[PDB]
Amino acid sequence: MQVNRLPFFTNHFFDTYLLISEDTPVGSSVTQLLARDMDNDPLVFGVSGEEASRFFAVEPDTGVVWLRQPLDRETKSEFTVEFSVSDHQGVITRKVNIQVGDVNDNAPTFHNQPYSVRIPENTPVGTPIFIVNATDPDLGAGGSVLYSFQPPSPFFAIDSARGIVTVIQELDYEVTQAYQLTVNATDQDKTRPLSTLANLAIIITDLE
Ligand SMILES: [Ca+2]
Ligand SMILES: [Ca+2]
Ligand SMILES: [Ca+2]
Ligand SMILES: [Cl-]
Ligand code: NA
Ligand code: NA
Ligand code: NA
């Protein structure tokens, strides 16, 4: 007799990877599973696995794969997903690597606040007194932070790439005993930069 011929997948992505942008809206089709059954049997498609089934859903008859929950590359940057196809006599599965594509969706975050430093009034021009650090988990320019004072200061400077704060004019405890500066950390996304502000207190101490 004839033995049933099981279906097999014909998508090219099973051998490489599927890319899905993290800004993909829920409900969006992310691909369509394609399969052949040489008996011309009607086929039913699925996704298997607890995590995969949470994030992705599959139209049983058409094989269209849907986004069921929002993606977030900064929480999980890829998935290994098992898809199935069945002619109702047997079930064939195959795995695909899904890469989550980055969008610039995070502002920088400053660590180890509150920021404060005490320096003596004879601290000379050029002296580094504080290093600010903000991180940005996005990729490329959207993850590359630049620092500035906003508003600017005539007494202190901050290195835009390194976050190193230096004295740029002589200090004088009699004139000013404290400064309140605002550091801006911005990513360098070309279309939609995101930024964050942090306070820096510089306290001047008198020699005696
Ligand atoms: Ca078949
Ligand atoms: Ca991102
Ligand atoms: Ca960013
Ligand atoms: Cl297959
Ligand atoms: Na499932
Ligand atoms: Na994200
Ligand atoms: Na970064």
PDB file of C-alpha atoms and ligand atoms in Angstrom, residues 22-23 71-75 100-106 137-138, ligand 6:
ATOM      1  CA  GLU A  22      10.434  45.108  19.193  1.00  0.00           C
ATOM      2  CA  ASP A  23       8.019  47.895  18.190  1.00  0.00           C
ATOM      3  CA  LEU A  71       8.357  42.109  22.562  1.00  0.00           C
ATOM      4  CA  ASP A  72      11.118  43.952  24.448  1.00  0.00           C
ATOM      5  CA  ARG A  73      14.651  43.357  23.186  1.00  0.00           C
ATOM      6  CA  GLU A  74      16.053  44.681  26.484  1.00  0.00           C
ATOM      7  CA  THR A  75      14.182  41.936  28.405  1.00  0.00           C
ATOM      8  CA  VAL A 100      14.191  40.756  18.354  1.00  0.00           C
ATOM      9  CA  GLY A 101      15.164  43.946  16.513  1.00  0.00           C
ATOM     10  CA  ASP A 102      16.097  47.023  18.454  1.00  0.00           C
ATOM     11  CA  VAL A 103      14.299  50.316  18.539  1.00  0.00           C
ATOM     12  CA  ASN A 104      15.446  53.302  20.569  1.00  0.00           C
ATOM     13  CA  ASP A 105      12.893  52.946  23.371  1.00  0.00           C
ATOM     14  CA  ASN A 106      14.973  53.669  26.503  1.00  0.00           C
ATOM     15  CA  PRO A 137      20.629  49.655  26.968  1.00  0.00           C
ATOM     16  CA  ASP A 138      19.537  50.366  23.352  1.00  0.00           C
TER      17      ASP A 138
HETATM   18 NA    NA B   6      12.703  47.697  24.599  1.00  0.00          NA
END
